[PDB]
Protein backbone atom coordinates (compact mmCIF):
# COMPACT_ATOMS: atom_id res chain seq x y z
CA UNK A 1 0.00 0.00 0.00
CA UNK A 2 0.93 3.73 -0.14
CA UNK A 3 1.13 6.73 2.25
CA UNK A 4 -0.54 9.98 0.95
CA UNK A 5 2.02 12.61 2.20
CA UNK A 6 0.43 15.77 0.60
CA UNK A 7 -1.94 17.25 -2.04
CA UNK A 8 -0.05 18.43 -5.16
CA UNK A 9 -3.28 20.13 -6.41
CA UNK A 10 -6.72 19.70 -8.10
CA UNK A 11 -7.01 18.81 -11.84
CA UNK A 12 -9.95 19.59 -14.19
CA UNK A 13 -11.89 16.55 -12.70
CA UNK A 14 -10.18 15.44 -9.42
CA UNK A 15 -7.38 15.36 -6.76
CA UNK A 16 -3.61 14.57 -7.06
CA UNK A 17 -1.49 13.53 -4.02
CA UNK A 18 2.19 12.77 -3.36
CA UNK A 19 2.07 9.01 -2.43
CA UNK A 20 5.15 7.33 -0.80
CA UNK A 21 5.33 3.49 -1.13
CA UNK A 22 5.14 1.96 2.43
CA UNK A 23 7.62 -0.88 1.45
CA UNK A 24 9.88 0.95 -1.09
CA UNK A 25 9.63 4.72 -0.24
CA UNK A 26 9.28 5.26 -4.09
CA UNK A 27 7.50 8.67 -4.33
CA UNK A 28 4.76 8.88 -7.06
CA UNK A 29 1.86 11.20 -7.95
CA UNK A 30 -1.52 9.46 -7.50
CA UNK A 31 -4.91 10.73 -8.77
CA UNK A 32 -7.74 9.29 -6.56
CA UNK A 33 -11.25 9.41 -8.18
CA UNK A 34 -14.76 8.56 -6.72
CA UNK A 35 -17.10 7.48 -14.55
CA UNK A 36 -17.51 7.28 -18.34
CA UNK A 37 -14.99 10.16 -17.80
CA UNK A 38 -12.22 8.18 -15.97
CA UNK A 39 -12.63 5.19 -18.40
CA UNK A 40 -11.71 7.74 -21.14
CA UNK A 41 -8.82 9.45 -19.19
CA UNK A 42 -7.12 6.01 -18.47
CA UNK A 43 -7.47 4.95 -22.14
CA UNK A 44 -5.85 8.26 -23.33
CA UNK A 45 -3.10 7.98 -20.67
CA UNK A 46 -2.34 4.45 -22.06
CA UNK A 47 -1.71 5.91 -25.62
CA UNK A 48 0.92 8.44 -24.39
CA UNK A 49 4.60 7.88 -25.19
CA UNK A 50 6.65 11.09 -25.40
CA UNK A 51 9.44 12.85 -23.48
CA UNK A 52 7.22 16.01 -23.18
CA UNK A 53 4.14 14.09 -21.92
CA UNK A 54 3.84 12.75 -18.30
CA UNK A 55 4.63 9.03 -17.65
CA UNK A 56 1.52 6.97 -16.70
CA UNK A 57 2.43 3.91 -14.52
CA UNK A 58 -1.07 2.32 -14.32
CA UNK A 59 -4.34 2.17 -12.33
CA UNK A 60 -6.16 0.27 -9.50
CA UNK A 61 -9.91 0.47 -8.55
CA UNK A 62 -11.53 -0.39 -5.14
CA UNK A 63 -15.37 0.12 -5.19
CA UNK A 64 -16.22 3.84 -4.53
CA UNK A 65 -12.60 4.80 -5.58
CA UNK A 66 -10.05 4.53 -8.48
CA UNK A 67 -6.29 5.34 -8.34
CA UNK A 68 -4.14 6.69 -11.29
CA UNK A 69 -0.35 6.32 -10.92
CA UNK A 70 1.99 8.88 -12.51
CA UNK A 71 5.68 9.84 -12.55
CA UNK A 72 6.23 12.41 -9.74
CA UNK A 73 7.67 15.55 -11.44
CA UNK A 74 10.63 16.41 -9.17
CA UNK A 75 10.73 19.99 -10.58
CA UNK A 76 7.04 20.63 -9.70
CA UNK A 77 5.01 22.89 -12.06
CA UNK A 78 5.89 25.61 -14.54
CA UNK A 79 3.39 27.75 -12.58
CA UNK A 80 5.95 27.91 -9.70
CA UNK A 81 8.75 29.16 -12.08
CA UNK A 82 6.68 32.22 -13.14
CA UNK A 83 7.56 35.24 -10.96
CA UNK A 84 4.36 37.32 -10.60
CA UNK A 85 4.52 40.57 -12.62
CA UNK A 86 8.04 39.56 -13.97
CA UNK A 87 7.83 36.07 -15.61
CA UNK A 88 11.15 34.32 -16.22
CA UNK A 89 14.33 34.85 -18.28
CA UNK A 90 13.45 34.87 -22.00
CA UNK A 91 15.83 31.96 -22.77
CA UNK A 92 14.12 29.70 -20.14
CA UNK A 93 10.67 30.76 -21.58
CA UNK A 94 11.82 29.88 -25.18
CA UNK A 95 13.18 26.46 -24.11
CA UNK A 96 9.91 25.61 -22.22
CA UNK A 97 7.91 26.87 -25.26
CA UNK A 98 10.05 24.61 -27.60
CA UNK A 99 9.20 21.64 -25.30
CA UNK A 100 5.49 22.58 -25.00
CA UNK A 101 5.25 22.66 -28.85
CA UNK A 102 7.05 19.25 -29.05
CA UNK A 103 4.44 17.82 -26.60
CA UNK A 104 1.44 19.43 -28.35
CA UNK A 105 2.68 18.26 -31.86
CA UNK A 106 2.98 14.70 -30.39
CA UNK A 107 -0.64 14.84 -28.95
CA UNK A 108 -2.16 16.39 -32.12
CA UNK A 109 -0.31 13.79 -34.28
CA UNK A 110 -2.09 10.96 -32.35
CA UNK A 111 -5.45 12.82 -32.71
CA UNK A 112 -5.62 13.91 -29.04
CA UNK A 113 -6.45 17.48 -27.89
CA UNK A 114 -5.53 18.40 -24.29
CA UNK A 115 -8.10 21.28 -23.95
CA UNK A 116 -6.65 22.69 -20.63
CA UNK A 117 -3.08 23.81 -21.37
CA UNK A 118 -1.91 26.19 -18.63
CA UNK A 119 1.20 26.38 -16.37
CA UNK A 120 -0.51 24.34 -13.54
CA UNK A 121 -0.68 21.33 -16.00
CA UNK A 122 2.94 21.66 -17.25
CA UNK A 123 5.42 19.86 -14.96
CA UNK A 124 9.26 19.78 -14.84
CA UNK A 125 11.49 16.69 -14.28
CA UNK A 126 14.87 16.90 -12.38
CA UNK A 127 16.52 18.24 -15.61
CA UNK A 128 13.72 20.93 -16.05
CA UNK A 129 12.22 19.11 -19.08
CA UNK A 130 8.55 20.09 -19.48
CA UNK A 131 5.81 17.43 -19.29
CA UNK A 132 2.17 17.99 -20.32
CA UNK A 133 -0.02 16.48 -17.53
CA UNK A 134 -3.75 16.25 -16.54
CA UNK A 135 -5.64 14.39 -19.29
CA UNK A 136 -8.98 14.75 -17.44
CA UNK A 137 -10.38 16.98 -20.32
CA UNK A 138 -8.41 15.36 -23.17
CA UNK A 139 -10.47 13.88 -26.07
CA UNK A 140 -10.09 12.43 -29.60
CA UNK A 141 -10.38 15.04 -32.42
CA UNK A 142 -9.09 12.80 -35.24
CA UNK A 143 -9.79 9.07 -35.82
CA UNK A 144 -9.16 7.02 -39.03
CA UNK A 145 -7.70 10.24 -40.54
CA UNK A 146 -11.11 12.01 -40.08
CA UNK A 147 -11.36 15.24 -38.03
CA UNK A 148 -14.31 15.74 -35.64
CA UNK A 149 -15.20 19.28 -34.45
CA UNK A 150 -15.53 19.87 -30.69
CA UNK A 151 -18.89 21.15 -29.43
CA UNK A 152 -18.28 21.25 -25.60
CA UNK A 153 -17.02 24.30 -23.61
CA UNK A 154 -14.25 23.39 -21.15
CA UNK A 155 -10.80 24.47 -19.93
CA UNK A 156 -9.90 27.63 -18.03
CA UNK A 157 -11.37 31.01 -18.95
CA UNK A 158 -8.14 33.11 -19.20
CA UNK A 159 -6.55 30.31 -21.38
CA UNK A 160 -9.60 29.51 -23.64
CA UNK A 161 -9.76 30.60 -27.29
CA UNK A 162 -12.56 33.08 -28.14
CA UNK A 163 -14.27 30.70 -30.66
CA UNK A 164 -15.00 28.29 -27.74
CA UNK A 165 -17.21 31.03 -26.13
CA UNK A 166 -18.89 31.89 -29.48
CA UNK A 167 -19.18 28.90 -31.89
CA UNK A 168 -21.41 25.82 -31.44
CA UNK A 169 -18.57 23.71 -33.00
CA UNK A 170 -14.86 24.52 -33.54
CA UNK A 171 -11.54 22.88 -34.52
CA UNK A 172 -9.51 21.38 -31.57
CA UNK A 173 -5.98 22.31 -32.73
CA UNK A 174 -6.30 26.14 -32.84
CA UNK A 175 -7.80 26.08 -29.29
CA UNK A 176 -4.64 24.30 -27.92
CA UNK A 177 -2.42 26.74 -29.92
CA UNK A 178 -4.26 29.73 -28.31
CA UNK A 179 -3.74 28.35 -24.76
CA UNK A 180 0.00 27.89 -25.61
CA UNK A 181 0.09 31.63 -26.55
CA UNK A 182 -1.41 32.60 -23.18
CA UNK A 183 1.19 30.32 -21.46
CA UNK A 184 3.99 32.10 -23.42
CA UNK A 185 2.50 35.50 -22.26
CA UNK A 186 2.51 34.24 -18.63
CA UNK A 187 6.18 33.07 -18.91
CA UNK A 188 7.34 36.45 -20.39
CA UNK A 189 5.20 38.91 -18.27
CA UNK A 190 4.20 37.01 -15.09
CA UNK A 191 0.62 38.18 -15.72
CA UNK A 192 -2.43 36.90 -17.71
CA UNK A 193 -3.67 39.42 -20.30
CA UNK A 194 -7.46 39.05 -19.62
CA UNK A 195 -10.19 37.24 -17.60
CA UNK A 196 -11.63 35.83 -20.83
CA UNK A 197 -11.36 36.64 -24.54
CA UNK A 198 -14.83 38.27 -24.89
CA UNK A 199 -15.73 41.80 -26.22
CA UNK A 200 -17.28 42.38 -22.72
CA UNK A 201 -13.58 42.20 -21.50
CA UNK A 202 -11.71 45.54 -21.92
CA UNK A 203 -8.19 44.04 -21.76
CA UNK A 204 -9.15 41.76 -24.75
CA UNK A 205 -10.65 44.76 -26.69
CA UNK A 206 -7.40 46.73 -26.06
CA UNK A 207 -5.42 43.81 -27.61
CA UNK A 208 -7.65 43.58 -30.70
CA UNK A 209 -7.07 47.40 -30.97
CA UNK A 210 -3.28 46.66 -30.67
CA UNK A 211 -2.59 48.76 -27.52
CA UNK A 212 0.68 46.86 -26.91
CA UNK A 213 2.06 49.90 -25.02
CA UNK A 214 -0.18 48.51 -22.18
CA UNK A 215 0.70 45.56 -19.84
CA UNK A 216 1.37 42.70 -20.17
CA UNK A 217 2.53 43.41 -23.74
CA UNK A 218 4.94 46.27 -22.91
CA UNK A 219 6.97 43.81 -20.76
CA UNK A 220 7.45 41.59 -23.83
CA UNK A 221 10.32 42.02 -26.28
CA UNK A 222 9.20 42.90 -29.84
CA UNK A 223 10.28 39.47 -31.25
CA UNK A 224 8.23 37.15 -28.93
CA UNK A 225 5.42 39.78 -29.09
CA UNK A 226 5.38 39.32 -32.91
CA UNK A 227 4.82 35.56 -32.33
CA UNK A 228 2.05 36.32 -29.80
CA UNK A 229 0.41 38.61 -32.48
CA UNK A 230 0.09 35.52 -34.78
CA UNK A 231 -1.09 33.08 -31.96
CA UNK A 232 -3.67 35.35 -30.31
CA UNK A 233 -5.67 35.95 -33.54
CA UNK A 234 -9.47 35.90 -32.78
CA UNK A 235 -10.47 34.08 -36.04
CA UNK A 236 -9.24 30.46 -35.59
CA UNK A 237 -8.93 29.97 -39.38
CA UNK A 238 -6.44 32.93 -39.59
CA UNK A 239 -4.53 31.87 -36.38
CA UNK A 240 -0.96 30.54 -36.90
CA UNK A 241 -0.60 26.70 -36.96
CA UNK A 242 2.24 24.84 -35.18
CA UNK A 243 4.21 24.24 -38.48
CA UNK A 244 4.33 28.09 -38.99
CA UNK A 245 5.20 28.68 -35.26
CA UNK A 246 8.25 26.43 -35.95
CA UNK A 247 9.15 29.04 -38.66
CA UNK A 248 8.75 32.10 -36.41
CA UNK A 249 11.78 34.44 -35.95
CA UNK A 250 11.74 34.41 -32.10
CA UNK A 251 11.03 30.64 -32.04
CA UNK A 252 14.30 30.20 -34.06
CA UNK A 253 16.36 32.90 -32.21
CA UNK A 254 19.55 31.65 -30.44
CA UNK A 255 19.26 32.75 -26.73
CA UNK A 256 21.83 32.36 -23.85
CA UNK A 257 21.03 29.91 -20.93
Ligand X SMILES: Cc1nn(C)cc1Nc1nc(N)c2c(C#N)c(N3CCC[C@H]3C)n(C)c2n1
CB contact at 8 A, 32 and 65: yes
End-to-end CA distance of the chain: 42
Give the count of beta carbons closer than 10 Å to the beta carbon of residue 48: 18
- The option from Cl ion, ligand X, none interacting with 186 (CB < 5 to 8 A, set by class) reads Cl ion
Q: Does 82 bind Cl ion (CB under 5 A)?
A: yes
Q: Print the binding letters for residues 197-226 with ligand X: x by CB under 6 A, - otherwise.
A: ------------------------------
Q: Which 3 state secondary structure label does DSSP give 241? A: coil
Q: Does 123 bind ligand X (CB under 6 A)?
A: yes
Stretch that binds Cl ion, among 58-66, 82-90, 158-166, 196-204 (CB under 5 A): 82-90
Q: How far is the CB of 135 from ligand X (least distance, A)?
A: 9
CB contact at 8 A, 250 and 223: yes
- The option from Cl ion, ligand X, none interacting with 188 (CB < 5 to 8 A, set by class) reads none
Interatomic CA distance for residues 243 and 245, integer angstroms: 6
Stretch that binds Cl ion, among 12-20, 104-112, 180-188, 232-240 (CB under 5 A): 180-188
Helices (H) and strands (E) in the chain, counts: 7, 11
Residues numbered 183-212 forming contacts with Cl ion, rule: CB under 5 A:
186
- Is 71 labelled a binding residue? no
Q: Print the binding letters for residues 2-41 with ligand X: x by CB under 6 A, - otherwise.
A: ------xxxx----x------------x------------
Comparing CA positions, the residue from 2, 103, 111 lying closest to residue 54 is 103
CB contact at 8 A, 67 and 32: yes
Interatomic CA distance for residues 16 and 73, integer angstroms: 12
Q: Print the binding letters for residues 64-93 with ligand X: x by CB under 6 A, - otherwise.
A: ------xxxxx-xx----------------
Interatomic CA distance for residues 160 and 153, integer angstroms: 9
- Is 12 labelled a binding residue? yes
Residue set of the binding site? 8-16, 31
Site residues for ligand X per CB under 6 A? 8-11, 16, 29, 54, 70-74, 76-77, 120-121, 123, 133-134
Amino acid sequence: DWDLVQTLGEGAYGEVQLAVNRVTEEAVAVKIVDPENIKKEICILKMLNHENVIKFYGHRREGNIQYLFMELASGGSLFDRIEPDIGMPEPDAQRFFHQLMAGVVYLHGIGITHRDIKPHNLLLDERDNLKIADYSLATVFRYNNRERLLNKMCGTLPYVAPELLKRREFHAEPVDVWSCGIVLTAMLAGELPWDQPSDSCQEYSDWKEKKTYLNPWKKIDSAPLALLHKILVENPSARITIPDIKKDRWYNKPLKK
